[PDB]
């Protein structure tokens, strides 16, 4: 957040979950980052740079996260036509 | 009557069988004298109890596995059941066929082999 100078304030800028577009607080212990491993996709062997996600507790606790994690990987890979 | 064993007996009885499994017999008197040497039990009457329960446990340990304590040879046979069972080496019997409405899925996913057809009657409980 900006000021007169454009100087940035706020002690931490919180992170905003992928499929809910809302922000998770300092205490919120049902919110998970989930690391998918990429592969080279020529031999199907692990190669470094991961795809990382974040999900909030609200969609987790109702049981909607399973669709969100699927759709996120469906707009990328690995998922073709499921 | 009464005389239901306390937890102080049942705690140490398990321990003494785990780490001195070999020394045990199944006689009262032999199992007493072993407990006297591998540990000190500060009373005499207490000693006569802990031996008798150690004896009573050792009867059951020579059958199937007890669920309160572990010994080595049971964890052997555990491993022997849990690395191969004699029932199969084949997956599952190598060829298993399926009925239609599964075949329609496979038709649209480029598979077209090893099937049977039976079109079983309507319906649930009917």
């Amino acid at each position: 957040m900006q000021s007169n100078a454009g100087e940035f304030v706020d002690l931490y800028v919180p992170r905003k979950c992928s499929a809910s577009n809302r922000i998770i607080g300092a205490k919120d212990h049902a919110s998970i980052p989930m690391n998918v491993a990429e592969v080279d996709k020529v031999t199907g062997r692990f190669n470094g740079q991961s795809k990382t996600y974040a999900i909030c507790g609200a969609i987790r606790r109702m049981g909607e996260s399973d669709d969100s994690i699927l759709r996120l990987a469906k707009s990328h890979g690995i998922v073709s036509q499921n | 009557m009464g005389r239901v064993r306390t937890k102080t007996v049942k705690k140490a009885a398990r321990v003494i069988i785990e780490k001195y499994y070999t020394r045990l017999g199944n006689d009262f008197h032999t199992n007493k004298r072993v407990c006297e040497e591998i540990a000190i039990i500060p009373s005499k009457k207490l000693r006569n109890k802990i031996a008798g329960y150690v004896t009573h446990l050792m009867k059951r340990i020579q059958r199937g596995p007890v669920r309160g304590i572990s010994i080595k040879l049971q964890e052997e046979e555990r491993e022997r059941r849990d690395n191969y069972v004699p029932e199969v080496s084949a997956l599952d019997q190598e060829i298993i066929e399926v009925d239609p409405d599964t075949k329609e899925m496979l038709k649209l996913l480029d598979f077209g082999s090893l099937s049977n057809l039976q079109v079983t009657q309507p319906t649930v409980g009917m």
Partner: protein, 129 residues
């Protein structure tokens, strides 16, 4: 009955956004709802929206994001005279800095920030933030 159409409309998109959705169905499609959502789209609280056509009155479908917190209606429709304005916007908005009271004027439907630059009072409809 369905006395006021716009008032029944906003509660759906309010309820839907809370549960976590991104497509809705709102009926029965008034022209008033269209120009409302047009202004609400420019600022960026909702995405593009598709008007289905029927002869009856139509149906509208919306694509939305979590940016919206709540859009409410204010009914019945009171007048504002550009000195009553400051009193309204204090009660109805979380902050001076952002939030947008909507209204209709003879110069068309618009936010309050625009109306002040045209010197036009008029009838208030709802709000959002």
């Amino acid at each position: 009955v369905r006395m006021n159409v716009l008032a029944d409309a906003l509660k759906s998109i309010n309820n839907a956004e809370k549960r976590g959705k991104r497509q809705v169905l709102i009926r029965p499609c008034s022209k008033v709802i269209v120009r409302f959502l047009t202004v609400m789209m420019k600022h960026g609280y909702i995405g593009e929206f598709e008007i289905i056509d029927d002869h009856r009155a139509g149906k509208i479908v919306v694509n939305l994001t979590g940016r919206l917190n709540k859009c409410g209606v204010i009914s019945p429709r009171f007048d504002v005279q550009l000195k009553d304005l400051e009193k309204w916007q204090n009660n109805l908005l979380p902050s001076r800095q952002f939030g947008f009271i909507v209204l209709t004027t003879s110069a068309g439907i618009m936010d309050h920030e625009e109306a002040r630059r045209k010197h036009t009072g008029g009838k208030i409809l709802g709000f959002f933030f």
